[PDB]
C-alpha cells in the first residue's frame, strides 16, 4: 500500500586529486539496504539491511558491475556538463541522481521517478508519463536531445514498470518482518520551567517507523501552528526516527494544552497532556 524503492547517486569532482568519487545508496521505503563507494579498495555493492544479505553472488556481482560502470559514466557526464556551462577545470562540481518506483496495493507501478541535479539544482527529469523530459535550462536541453536519440525514456519506462517493481516486491516479502510492521512512536510530554511567568511543554515521539509523522499542540482545541517549535524528523541511529514539538505556555495554563500524534503504526491518533 504505497511502498517505494529509491536509488541515490552522488558524484563529486576533485580537480588535481584524481577522478570524481561516486557513491550510491539504495532504499526501500525509509530503510537503506545497499551502498557503494568507488573509493573503496575493491569496490563492491554492500548490504546495509539484514533481509538483503540472502541475495546470491550473481546479485552482488551484477549490481557491483552496474555501479562500476556508473562511476565511469558519471565522470563522462561531469566533463560534459563542465563544457555545457563553460566552466573551468579548477572547481569541484556535483552530479546527483535519484530514481525508482512507487508500487500500489495491487502490486503495479503507481509512479516512476528519474531525475538529476547539477551543483544542487534541478537539471533534467523524466516526466510522470515516463515518455517525456523536463529540461531545466539550455544545457539540459542538449542532454535531452542525446537521450531522445538514444531512446532513454523507453528504456527507463521498461525498468520502472517491470524490473523495478518486481525487485521492490521481492524485497518487501523478504524483509516483511521489519518493512511491513510499522513501529508506533513511544510518546511522552516533558515540562521545563523557563521562569515564573511561563514554561515549555515538549511533546516527544521516539523510535517510530516509518518517518512520516504529525505532531501538533492544541490549546482548548485550537492548533498552535504559529507558536509551536517543531524540529526536523531525525534518525535515532537504529533505523527508527525521532521528533518533538514544543510550545511556550503561561504558568498555570498547562491544562489547556494537548499534544496530538498521528502515525500509521498507531491504532488511533494519540492525544497527550501534561
Amino acid at each position: 500500500g504505497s511502498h517505494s524503492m529509491r536509488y541515490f547517486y552522488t558524484s563529486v569532482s576533485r580537480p588535481g586529486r584524481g577522478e570524481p568519487r561516486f557513491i550510491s545508496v539504495g532504499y526501500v521505503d525509509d530503510t537503506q539496504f545497499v551502498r557503494f563507494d568507488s573509493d573503496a579498495a575493491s569496490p563492491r555493492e554492500e548490504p546495509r539491511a539484514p533481509w538483503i544479505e540472502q541475495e546470491g553472488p550473481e546479485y552482488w556481482d551484477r549490481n557491483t558491475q552496474i555501479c562500476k560502470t556508473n562511476t565511469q559514466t558519471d565522470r563522462e557526464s561531469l566533463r560534459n556538463l563542465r563544457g555545457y556551462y563553460n566552466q573551468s577545470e579548477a572547481g569541484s562540481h556535483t552530479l546527483q541522481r535519484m530514481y525508482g518506483c512507487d508500487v500500489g496495493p495491487d502490486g503495479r507501478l503507481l509512479r516512476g521517478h528519474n531525475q538529476f541535479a547539477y551543483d544542487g539544482k534541478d537539471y533534467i527529469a523524466l516526466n510522470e508519463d515516463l515518455s517525456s523530459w523536463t529540461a531545466a535550462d539550455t544545457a539540459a536541453q542538449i542532454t535531452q536531445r542525446k537521450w531522445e536519440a538514444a531512446r532513454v525514456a523507453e528504456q527507463l519506462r521498461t525498468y520502472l514498470e517491470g524490473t523495478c517493481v518486481e525487485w521492490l516486491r521481492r524485497y518487501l516479502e523478504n524483509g516483511k518482518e521489519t518493512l511491513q510492521r510499522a513501529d508506533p512512536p513511544k510518546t511522552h510530554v516533558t515540562h521545563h520551567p523557563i521562569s515564573d511567568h511561563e514554561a515549555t511543554l515538549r511533546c516527544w515521539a521516539l523510535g517510530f517507523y516509518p518517518a512520516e509523522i504529525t505532531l501538533t499542540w492544541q490549546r482548548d482545541g485550537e492548533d498552535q501552528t504559529q507558536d509551536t517549535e517543531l524540529v526536523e524528523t531525525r534518525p535515532a541511529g537504529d533505523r527508527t526516527f525521532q521528533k518533538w514539538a514544543a510550545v511556550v505556555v503561561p504558568s498555570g495554563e498547562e491544562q489547556r494544552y494537548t499534544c496530538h500524534v498521528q502515525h500509521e503504526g498507531l491504532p488511533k491518533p494519540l492525544t497527550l497532556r501534561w
Binding site: 551484477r62 555501479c67 556508473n70 559514466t73 557526464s77 524490473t163
Partner: peptide, 9 residues
C-alpha cells in the same frame, strides 16, 4: 536492483 541502462549527460 539498479537500472542497467547507462547514458552520459
Amino acid at each position: 536492483s539498479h537500472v542497467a541502462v547507462e547514458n552520459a549527460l
